[PDB]
Design a protein around this ligand. Structure first.
Ligand SMILES: *[C@@H]1O[C@H](CO)[C@@H](O[C@@H]2O[C@H](CO)[C@@H](O[C@@H]3O[C@H](CO)[C@@H](O)[C@H](O[C@H]4O[C@H](CO)[C@@H](O)[C@H](O)[C@@H]4O[C@H]4O[C@H](CO)[C@@H](O)[C@H](O)[C@@H]4O[C@H]4O[C@H](CO)[C@@H](O)[C@H](O)[C@@H]4O)[C@@H]3O)[C@H](O)[C@H]2NC(C)=O)[C@H](O)[C@H]1NC(C)=O
Ligand SMILES: *[C@@H]1O[C@H](CO)[C@@H](O[C@@H]2O[C@H](CO)[C@@H](O)[C@H](O)[C@H]2NC(C)=O)[C@H](O)[C@H]1NC(C)=O
Ligand SMILES: *[C@@H]1O[C@H](CO)[C@@H](O)[C@H](O)[C@H]1NC(C)=O
Ligand SMILES: *[C@@H]1O[C@H](CO)[C@@H](O)[C@H](O)[C@H]1NC(C)=O
Length: 484
């Protein structure tokens, strides 16, 4: 059966006298073998957890784990998202306790002390039963970082597509997309991105304004805000999985290549060249992306509004909305600016081919932190205080937290936009992590973001099936060691 409950979480694990707030969780005993059986714990991470029921079922990898080991499944909503926020208003003062250490200790404290409605004894808490922590994306890093920082509560860990390395100028976000996309699209998108840079850096004012109008963006006043719309094509790669078919991304590349779906004649790998690619990219954005783009934020209603592209308007509701249920993931922007993780999604450095404009730069994103988070009662965000990526990585270990691990398995995707923040990054010093029996790591061929989490990928792709089968057997083997 299923239910939902609240756990009384510590606001500040370092200072319990500051009190508690109520943290939402959901649970399922569909596969549970009774008190003493395993518990699979999954934190949906950078989002409200309400639309995540499926993780209780074997339609997802967490359910498959549970069925394999006779485990309960618990879905825990992250502090400061949804119904797990201590405050109704999120600003630089109230977000002071939205940190990685608090988020890690939330998980161990919960597993050690929660009173589960389905087992009123202590027999299902983590001191008495094996808890398996599973996470994808940021919650996969939360999972790995918990093994690094606070081992000894959870029994085993699986991290898929985990950004365990903080990186400031994360231009590598786009590198696996460039590698996975078609040759002609990649070439033509790069031509357009670099043309946008040339016109921004060397073109006249009349050239800049005219290029903006091609995209429908003549009213966008800051050139870097125009340049920042070009990644909307590449970003669609993040929505791919092995069952999305002729997806939004592949539609974008066909548009750039100037062909309708199913066309008999298509360009070869050489693409269509700058002039056509520019015209096609401009019209694709103007006609397919721009309409109702700003209206999707709720703050605006006009179909052709460009207000949401103006990142220099300190009064924009994108920056001033402090509500918990905001549509701009303000909570995540806090982690980026404050921890700081950064992961700014940028054009590549000079001398390295790029599929997004180099004018989309780390400084362009960093400039927005004080617009999201103006100083409040003396409180500011961590990167303004001088904290940087190494502050985080030297604590957690970053992608070198792999040194001496126990019962942690990793999965990554060959073409995951988050791969190069993780242990399988091609830019990790000493190369990507080498798999061992003690610490396995698998890369899904052709894989995207968290492709082993969704079982539709398992049935659709034999490469995914091989990876899922291996990690499920590894988790079962490790869990059995608890009872042996
Ligand atoms: C030059 O430019 C042209 C014009 O832009 C380029 O042509 C376009 O190329 C696109 C990319 O190749 C192509 O999109 C593809 O369309 C086919 C359908 O025609 C579709 O199958 C593709 O989608 C599959 O693959 C992606 C990538 O992994 C998956 O995200 C997606 O879910 C699909 O996956 C299924 O098929 C894969 C087989 O390729 C399996 O690996 C995967 O597991 C999954 O399998 C399920 O479905 C299978 C159905 O085949 C089934 O057998 C299996 O049992 C599972 O159920 C992708 O959308 C465009 O259509 C094309 N545009 C045109 C022709 O107008 C061209 O590539 C450029 N060339 C160069 C050299 O640069
Ligand atoms: C490109 O975007 C512009 C908006 O900047 C679109 O202009 C609107 O077009 C509709 C007609 O479909 C008019 O009703 C609006 O008054 C226009 N608003 C303007 C010009 O500010 C334009 O249609 C888009 N072009 C394409 C090809 O989609
Ligand atoms: C999901 O559970 C059902 C139980 O009725 C089982 O028949 C099915 O094989 C399971 N699927 C997976 C992928 O484990
Ligand atoms: C800046 O934001 C405020 C609030 O939405 C709005 O009234 C104003 O028109 C915006 N300015 C621009 C140039 O978009």
């Amino acid at each position: 059966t299923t239910g939902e409950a609240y756990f009384e979480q510590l606001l500040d694990h370092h200072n319990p006298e500051k009190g508690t707030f109520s943290q939402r969780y959901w649970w399922s005993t569909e596969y549970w073998g009774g008190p003493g059986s395993p518990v699979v714990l999954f934190n949906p991470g950078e989002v409200s957890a309400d639309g995540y029921e499926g993780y209780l079922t074997n339609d997802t990898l967490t359910g498959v784990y549970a069925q394999e080991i006779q485990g309960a499944v618990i879905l825990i909503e992250h502090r400061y998202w949804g119904d797990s926020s201590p405050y109704e208003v999120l600003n630089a003062e109230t977000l002071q306790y939205l940190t990685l250490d608090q988020s890690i200790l939330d998980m161990t404290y919960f597993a050690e002390t929660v009173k589960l409605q389905f087992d009123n004894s202590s027999r299902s808490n983590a001191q008495n039963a094996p808890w398996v922590m599973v996470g994808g994306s940021y919650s996969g890093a939360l999972t790995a970082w918990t093994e690094s920082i606070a081992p000894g509560t959870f029994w085993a860990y699986h991290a898929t597509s985990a950004p365990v390395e903080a990186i400031y100028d994360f231009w590598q976000y786009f590198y696996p997309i460039q590698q996975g996309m078609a040759q002609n699209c990649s070439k033509d998108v790069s031509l357009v991105a670099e043309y946008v840079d040339k016109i921004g850096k060397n073109g006249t004012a009349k050239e800049q304004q005219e290029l903006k109008e091609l995209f429908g963006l003549g009213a966008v006043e800051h050139y870097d805000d125009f340049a920042a719309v070009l990644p909307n094509g590449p970003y669609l790669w993040q929505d791919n999985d092995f069952v999305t078919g002729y997806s939004s991304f592949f539609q974008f590349c066909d548009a750039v290549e100037g062909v309708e779906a199913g066309a008999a004649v298509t360009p070869g790998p050489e693409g269509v060249g700058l002039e056509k690619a520019l015209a096609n990219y401009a019209n694709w954005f103007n006609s397919t992306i721009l309409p109702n783009y700003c209206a999707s934020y709720g703050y605006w209603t006009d179909e052709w509004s460009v207000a949401c592209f103006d990142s220099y308007n300190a009064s924009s509701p994108i920056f001033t909305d402090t509500s918990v249920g905001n549509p701009v993931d303000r909570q995540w922007e806090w982690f980026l600016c404050n921890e700081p993780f950064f992961w700014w999604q940028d054009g590549a450095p000079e001398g390295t081919s790029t599929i997004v404009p180099r004018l989309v730069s780390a400084s362009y994103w960093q400039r927005q932190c004080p617009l999201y988070f103006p100083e409040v009662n003396g409180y500011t965000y961590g990167s303004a205080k001088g904290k940087n990526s190494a502050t985080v990585n030297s604590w957690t270990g970053g992608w070198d937290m792999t040194r001496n691990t126990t019962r942690l398995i990793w999965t990554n995707g060959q073409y995951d936009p988050w791969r190069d923040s993780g242990v399988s990054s091609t830019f990790r010093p000493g190369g990507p992590l080498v798999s061992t029996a003690n610490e396995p790591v698998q890369i899904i061929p052709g894989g995207f973001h968290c492709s082993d989490l969704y079982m539709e990928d398992y049935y659709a792709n034999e490469g995914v099936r091989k990876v899922v089968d291996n990690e499920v057997k590894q988790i079962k083997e490790w869990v059995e060691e608890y009872y042996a």
